[PDB]
Design a protein around this ligand. Structure first.
Ligand SMILES: *[C@@H]1O[C@H](CO)[C@@H](O[C@@H]2O[C@H](CO)[C@@H](O)[C@H](O)[C@H]2NC(C)=O)[C@H](O)[C@H]1NC(C)=O
Ligand SMILES: *[C@@H]1O[C@H](CO)[C@@H](O[C@@H]2O[C@H](CO)[C@@H](O)[C@H](O)[C@H]2NC(C)=O)[C@H](O)[C@H]1NC(C)=O
Ligand SMILES: *[C@H]1O[C@H](CO)[C@@H](O[C@@H]2O[C@H](CO)[C@@H](O)[C@H](O)[C@H]2NC(C)=O)[C@H](O)[C@H]1NC(C)=O
Ligand SMILES: *[C@H]1O[C@H](CO)[C@@H](O[C@@H]2O[C@H](CO)[C@@H](O)[C@H](O)[C@H]2NC(C)=O)[C@H](O)[C@H]1NC(C)=O
Ligand SMILES: *C1O[C@H](CO)[C@@H](O)[C@H](O)[C@H]1NC(C)=O
Ligand SMILES: *C1O[C@H](CO)[C@@H](O)[C@H](O)[C@H]1NC(C)=O
Ligand SMILES: *C1O[C@H](CO)[C@@H](O)[C@H](O)[C@H]1NC(C)=O
Ligand SMILES: *C1O[C@H](CO)[C@@H](O)[C@H](O)[C@H]1NC(C)=O
Ligand SMILES: *[C@H]1O[C@H](CO)[C@@H](O)[C@H](O)[C@H]1NC(C)=O
Ligand SMILES: *[C@H]1O[C@H](CO)[C@@H](O)[C@H](O)[C@H]1NC(C)=O
Ligand SMILES: *C1O[C@H](CO)[C@@H](O)[C@H](O)[C@@H]1O
Ligand SMILES: *C1O[C@H](CO)[C@@H](O)[C@H](O)[C@@H]1O
Ligand SMILES: *[C@@H]1O[C@H](CO)[C@@H](O)[C@H](O)[C@@H]1O
Ligand SMILES: *[C@@H]1O[C@H](CO)[C@@H](O)[C@H](O)[C@@H]1O
Ligand SMILES: *[C@@H]1O[C@H](CO)[C@@H](O)[C@H](O)[C@@H]1O
Ligand SMILES: *[C@@H]1O[C@H](CO)[C@@H](O)[C@H](O)[C@@H]1O
Ligand SMILES: *[C@@H]1O[C@H](CO)[C@@H](O)[C@H](O)[C@@H]1O
Ligand SMILES: *[C@@H]1O[C@H](CO)[C@@H](O)[C@H](O)[C@@H]1O
Ligand SMILES: *[C@H]1O[C@H](CO)[C@@H](O)[C@H](O)[C@@H]1O
Ligand SMILES: *[C@H]1O[C@H](CO)[C@@H](O)[C@H](O)[C@@H]1O
Ligand SMILES: *[C@H]1O[C@H](CO)[C@@H](O)[C@H](O)[C@@H]1O
Ligand SMILES: *[C@H]1O[C@H](CO)[C@@H](O)[C@H](O)[C@@H]1O
Ligand SMILES: *[C@H]1O[C@H](CO)[C@@H](O)[C@H](O)[C@@H]1O
Ligand SMILES: *[C@H]1O[C@H](CO)[C@@H](O)[C@H](O)[C@@H]1O
Ligand SMILES: *[C@H]1O[C@H](CO)[C@@H](O)[C@H](O)[C@@H]1O
Ligand SMILES: *[C@H]1O[C@H](CO)[C@@H](O)[C@H](O)[C@@H]1O
Ligand SMILES: *[C@H]1O[C@H](CO)[C@@H](O)[C@H](O)[C@@H]1O
Ligand SMILES: *[C@H]1O[C@H](CO)[C@@H](O)[C@H](O)[C@@H]1O
Ligand SMILES: [Ca+2]
Ligand SMILES: [Ca+2]
Ligand SMILES: [Ca+2]
Ligand SMILES: [Ca+2]
Ligand SMILES: [Ca+2]
Ligand SMILES: [Ca+2]
Ligand SMILES: [Ca+2]
Ligand SMILES: [Ca+2]
Ligand SMILES: [Ca+2]
Ligand SMILES: [Ca+2]
Ligand SMILES: [Ca+2]
Ligand SMILES: [Ca+2]
Ligand SMILES: [Ca+2]
Ligand SMILES: [Ca+2]
Ligand SMILES: [Ca+2]
Ligand SMILES: [Ca+2]
Ligand SMILES: [Ca+2]
Ligand SMILES: [Ca+2]
Ligand SMILES: [Ca+2]
Ligand SMILES: [Ca+2]
Ligand SMILES: [Ca+2]
Ligand SMILES: [Ca+2]
Ligand SMILES: [Ca+2]
Ligand SMILES: [Ca+2]
Lengths: 541, 541
């Protein structure tokens, strides 16, 4: 089957309507009287009445102008019937192609397009892409789009910072001088022209591209002053010294604005540490390890600034990226102390009142503030000791008796104070412990002081020992003897050695009631040996 | 079978070519690979290559612009064959109608059109018709013509003598004053404009109509002079009298210029007749019947002019259509004549010499020229007659003898002349015949004059009769007698009567030779009777 040629109509016809197009008829009309009719969308189905057919002549016609963007192709079919109702021809397909006209301006999806580009990017850097669409036929000139830029705001540093690939709509940069710290955002008017951007024939329409310039690290941190000043006490470990104040021209609170300090020198021992204040962007220098004034009176330290992210290629590191802090140190008053802590001195027991035993040395760390050393009495339960403020020498007040309940253990303990005449007065407690050697200076006594027995000439009635306040050898074996005079006593009594320390006494008369006081000479070892005539009270019946 | 719609193309397309029109294809191409081709005049037959078909797509195209006036409709048919040579569709008819454009100016058959109109025809009179043709479609505006007049030469009496029925092209008159004797021919520029004579859109073209104004009888014949003069002799019958000279302002030698004269009066007797000179248009007056001067000395005749065809409606008959001719008549000398022609007069015979017999009357027609009448001798063989010039009276010269060989018959004939003393002298011959009565004036004689016989006394020897020169009764019976003396004769002889006219003589003596003269008296009747003695000579032996 040969196919009835399609009818090719341009849209937006001016008419006048009903505009006639074509005449379909059946050759069977040589003898039959036929009636024609079209069916289908555009004819009898919606949209109704666009295409009509003269029932007699078979002439086809359009009644209004067409619109390709509304309907592009109509599919009518044509009918043939004689006046007696017989179908004379099978319905036949007939096509109307509506041919495109350029009656649609290009349109942009958005009316505002957002894009961003980094600072000082090489000319040729892609930024963003803006595209329009055309409701007309893409396959025809009518729907083929070209792009260009109409205006840039603002016009600095160059009027034409950007361009646009007139087909793809890629906005690419063509100048240099994209500096956030000067012009932080550009607004562009993009224009779309169809008909392949033909100036006289093309229909045009615009949009906006807003390009924001994103920050980079191209400004170094710069200290507000060349030199800073701070103060620190001795022996402190968590105190702020100074606040280092900087300016960075980049974007606040970006890594490229955040400061990164380190102490380049002036503290070879690590007394200070540095941390960046998150909010204020300051160099907080803090004493991390304690300092000694008498080793260091002043600190002079250099400190270098930087950012968290590296600086840009061609930018200079200025002198103003380095400042110097002078740390003046405040000196404090401190405790005095002593060469030995518990000054040990050996000394014999019996000694004069007024003998200089030993001197007590005491010194002070404060080498730059010279002071009065105040030696004073503290705690000696015996009061045998004297000391003067200027000298610190120790002299005896009394005789030093080691067999005393004031010297419980073999040595005597004594405390002393050394005080500062400084505004905050300090003091240190010194000890003196002295070893007292036992000399034989105690006369032996008789132990059974009140030994009393009746008149029995018993072979061993009374046994006597010695009381001595001295330790070996100043006690040892004791000699027991009766005196020669009065003559009566050795005539009444007799003494016998047992071993060393124990001796017996017994009456050698044969025979009353009362008191008999019997003198006894007792001597102990330690030379020169001391004797004593301790009297024994005896009661006999 | 549904019929592929015809393709409707305007002629004179601007292209660009090859301009595509329609796409025919077979739906059988769903699986077959087809090849298309057109055939027919305009395709493969002459004219070749106007319409081509893309063998693959089936697209049809024109290659040059069309011309409706050259070919109006193309009848191509389209073919379909698969790549393996099979005919897939029966060839199908396809029609290109070339639609008309107005690209032809109207054309006139002739470039010069001839027509004629009579003088002073009523406004509305049809003259001629001029028509153009248009090579474009008559059924369309393009070939629909309108007419108008662009110019008239000359512009008098009115600029716009004619108009033209803008559709039929009939040139009809609209003014008055069509006067041949002023403007004899008009030239018209006719213009044809197509597009129904549309001034801005129509294409125009011209021709010429030359209108000649045909003559009518609207000018009367007018005599050059009020009066004319001529001269005529007496008794003439084919002589020209005068040439009547006229002017007619109409067209020479047309019936409306030809003169027609008649004599309205002045000649109640029909002496003159008038004929028109074919060439000179003159009134030739000719003497058709002879005239007599003595009855008419002068003629005064009025003569009316006219044309062969009647004069036009409103025109006046002038006085100058009537002239008057004075015919002066020249008088001629004419013959004189006589009251009686052969003047008969009775007269007795014997009459004196000098007797006035009768007078001869003679008269003359010339009543206005009085003349001398000249009576003269002519022919009389006897000379008995005399006549004098002044009187005309006749008197006798001699004695009038009727018995003469000069008057053979009973009467005497005599001729006479009467002559004119005029410059051309005329004359008339008069006759006079006179009856002469016989009187007895002749003496009788003897008839046998020489009767001679011998001497015999014979009873009847000599018989004698009479000789008389007169007729009865002046002869009649004659008496015969012998004289008394001499005495001897009646003694010798004797006379005897026989009857009347015859008598006998005889000698009565008894007895020689010689001559005997015998006298005899003889008398005749007519009174007074005359006798005579006639002698008879006788010889006897
Ligand atoms: C879009 O860009 C194209 C490619 O740069 C342009 O096409 C060129 O235009 C120049 C005119 O100066 C011609 O000399 C060249 O022949 C073109 N190059 C080719 C082969 O593509 C075009 O001008 C631009 N469109 C507009 C009007 O902006
Ligand atoms: C030819 O003649 C016709 C008939 O006279 C003209 O047609 C008329 O034109 C006048 C314009 O003055 C109109 O008002 C009338 O309506 C017309 N009459 C009709 C009904 O035919 C015509 O103008 C002439 N053509 C030209 C242009 O010369
Ligand atoms: C001062 O002298 C010494 C200081 O060492 C004291 O003697 C010590 O006493 C303690 C009792 O708790 C014993 O256990 C130690 O053996 C002793 N020290 C040594 C190692 O000798 C003494 O008590 C102090 N004061 C007195 C009362 O003398
Ligand atoms: C003159 O007289 C008469 C004129 O009539 C002549 O007589 C006639 O002569 C002819 C001869 O030819 C006769 O026949 C006639 O009878 C005569 N006339 C009549 C009627 O009488 C005559 O001849 C003339 N002349 C002479 C010689 O006399
Ligand atoms: C850019 O962001 C702004 C909001 O400030 C908005 O108006 C716009 O739609 C954004 N651009 C697009 C289309 O992504
Ligand atoms: C210095 O540091 C202290 C504690 O961080 C703060 O009180 C003070 O405001 C700082 N100086 C400035 C101006 O940042
Ligand atoms: C009119 O006659 C002239 C000759 O004088 C001639 O040129 C012309 O053809 C005639 N007109 C027509 C077409 O009859
Ligand atoms: C008068 O008529 C005579 C004869 O026809 C001729 O010779 C003469 O020329 C005429 N006159 C004129 C001027 O026609
Ligand atoms: C010794 O004994 C005698 C007993 O007669 C006594 O008198 C004397 O006082 C005694 N002496 C002493 C004190 O032993
Ligand atoms: C008569 O007769 C005689 C004869 O004798 C003669 O003498 C005479 O002369 C005659 N007369 C005549 C003349 O007759
Ligand atoms: C983009 O931006 C602004 C507002 O949307 C306009 O000035 C411009 O015409 C375009 O729409
Ligand atoms: C009719 O008459 C003459 C010569 O033919 C031209 O003047 C005029 O244009 C028209 O042809
Ligand atoms: C394109 O932009 C231009 C300039 O702002 C306007 O004229 C138009 O309305 C469209 O937004
Ligand atoms: C720190 O700044 C001081 C200025 O007082 C310099 O003397 C030193 O060299 C360092 O740069
Ligand atoms: C001496 O030392 C004592 C400790 O026994 C302290 O309490 C006193 O303050 C002084 O420094
Ligand atoms: C029609 O007549 C006009 C005027 O004579 C001319 O212009 C033209 O040539 C044609 O003959
Ligand atoms: C002929 O012409 C004459 C003029 O001489 C008139 O007298 C006469 O009446 C007639 O018209
Ligand atoms: C007399 O008549 C005669 C005729 O007999 C003429 O011949 C002559 O001229 C005259 O008129
Ligand atoms: C034009 O095309 C670009 C492709 O990148 C998109 O931005 C968007 O889809 C627009 O229609
Ligand atoms: C302090 O240190 C900085 C390092 O950034 C240098 O740029 C400057 O010259 C000074 O020595
Ligand atoms: C801090 O102080 C020290 C010494 O006084 C120097 O390094 C510097 O001049 C600053 O003033
Ligand atoms: C020494 O003396 C000072 C006061 O001067 C005290 O603060 C310290 O405890 C010690 O006894
Ligand atoms: C000397 O040392 C002793 C301890 O050995 C303390 O008890 C005294 O206070 C002083 O400092
Ligand atoms: C136009 O038509 C008229 C009809 O009278 C004719 O003169 C001639 O045939 C011309 O073509
Ligand atoms: C002569 O006769 C003519 C006749 O045409 C008259 O018109 C004129 O008045 C005169 O009588
Ligand atoms: C001819 O002559 C006669 C009379 O002489 C008149 O009728 C007229 O005057 C004309 O001159
Ligand atoms: C009368 O006389 C004339 C001459 O005067 C002749 O011409 C004529 O014939 C006749 O004899
Ligand atoms: C008289 O008449 C006769 C004829 O009767 C002529 O012969 C003669 O000439 C005259 O005229
Ligand atoms: Ca549209
Ligand atoms: Ca469109
Ligand atoms: Ca478009
Ligand atoms: Ca920058
Ligand atoms: Ca920075
Ligand atoms: Ca920056
Ligand atoms: Ca210290
Ligand atoms: Ca200190
Ligand atoms: Ca101190
Ligand atoms: Ca002691
Ligand atoms: Ca001791
Ligand atoms: Ca001891
Ligand atoms: Ca043409
Ligand atoms: Ca045409
Ligand atoms: Ca035309
Ligand atoms: Ca006229
Ligand atoms: Ca005339
Ligand atoms: Ca005329
Ligand atoms: Ca006459
Ligand atoms: Ca005369
Ligand atoms: Ca005369
Ligand atoms: Ca006589
Ligand atoms: Ca006689
Ligand atoms: Ca006689």
């Amino acid at each position: 089957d040969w196919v009835i040629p399609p009818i090719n109509l341009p849209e937006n016809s001016r008419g006048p309507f009903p505009q006639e197009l074509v005449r379909i008829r059946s050759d069977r009309d040589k003898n039959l009287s036929l009636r024609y009719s079209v069916t289908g969308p555009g004819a009898d189905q919606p949209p109704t009445g666009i295409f009509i057919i003269n029932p007699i002549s078979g002439q086809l016609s359009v009644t209004k102008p067409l619109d390709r963007e509304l309907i592009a192709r109509f599919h009518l079919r044509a009918h043939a019937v004689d006046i007696n109702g017989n179908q004379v021809e099978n319905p036949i397909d007939i096509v109307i192609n509506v041919i495109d006209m350029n009656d649609n301006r290009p349109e942009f999806l958005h009316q505002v397009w957002n894009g961003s580009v980094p600072e000082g990017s090489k000319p040729g850097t892609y930024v963003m892409t803006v595209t329009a669409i055309d409701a007309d036929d893409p396959n025809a000139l009518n729907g083929m789009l070209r792009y260009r830029i109409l205006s840039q705001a603002p016009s600095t540093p160059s009027p034409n910072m950007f361009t646009i690939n007139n087909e793809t709509g890629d906005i690419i940069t063509v100048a240099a001088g994209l500096d956030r710290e000067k012009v932080q955002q550009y607004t562009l008017i993009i224009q779309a022209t169809d008909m392949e951007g033909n100036p006289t024939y093309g229909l045009s329409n615009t949009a906006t591209a807003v390009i924001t310039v994103t920050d980079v690290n191209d400004n170094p941190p710069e200290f507000t002053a060349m030199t800073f000043y701070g103060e620190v006490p001795e022996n402190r470990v968590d105190v702020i010294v100074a606040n280092l104040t900087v300016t960075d021209k980049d974007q606040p609170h970006t890594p490229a604005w955040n400061a990164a300090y380190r102490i380049s020198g002036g503290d070879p021992t690590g007394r200070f540490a540095i941390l960046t204040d998150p909010n204020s962007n300051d160099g907080l220098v803090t004493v991390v390890k304690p300092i000694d004034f008498e080793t260091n009176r002043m600190f002079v330290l250099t400190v270098a600034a930087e950012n968290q992210v590296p600086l840009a290629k061609g930018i200079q590191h200025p002198p103003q990226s380095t400042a110097t802090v002078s740390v003046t140190v405040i000196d404090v008053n401190e405790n005095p102390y002593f060469a030995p802590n518990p000054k040990i001195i050996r000394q014999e027991e019996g000694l004069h009142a007024g003998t200089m035993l030993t001197t007590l040395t005491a010194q002070d760390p404060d080498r730059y503030m010279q002071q009065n050393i105040r030696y004073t009495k503290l705690s000696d339960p015996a009061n045998w000791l004297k000391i003067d403020p200027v000298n610190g020498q120790i002299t005896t007040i009394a005789v030093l008796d080691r067999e005393s309940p004031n010297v419980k253990n073999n040595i005597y303990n004594a405390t002393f104070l050394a005080s500062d005449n400084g505004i905050p007065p300090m003091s240190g407690t010194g000890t003196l412990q002295i070893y007292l050697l036992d000399i034989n200076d105690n006369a032996p006594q008789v132990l059974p002081q009140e030994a009393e027995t009746c008149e029995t000439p018993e072979p061993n009635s009374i046994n006597i020992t010695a009381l001595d306040y001295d330790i070996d050898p100043n006690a040892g074996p004791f000699a027991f003897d009766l005196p020669l005079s009065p003559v009566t006593i050795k005539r009444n009594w007799t003494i016998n050695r047992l071993n060393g320390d124990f001796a017996q006494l017994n009456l050698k008369i044969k025979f009353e009631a009362g008191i008999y006081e019997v003198p006894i000479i007792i001597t102990d070892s330690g030379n020169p040996p001391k004797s004593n005539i301790s009297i024994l009270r005896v009661k006999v019946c």
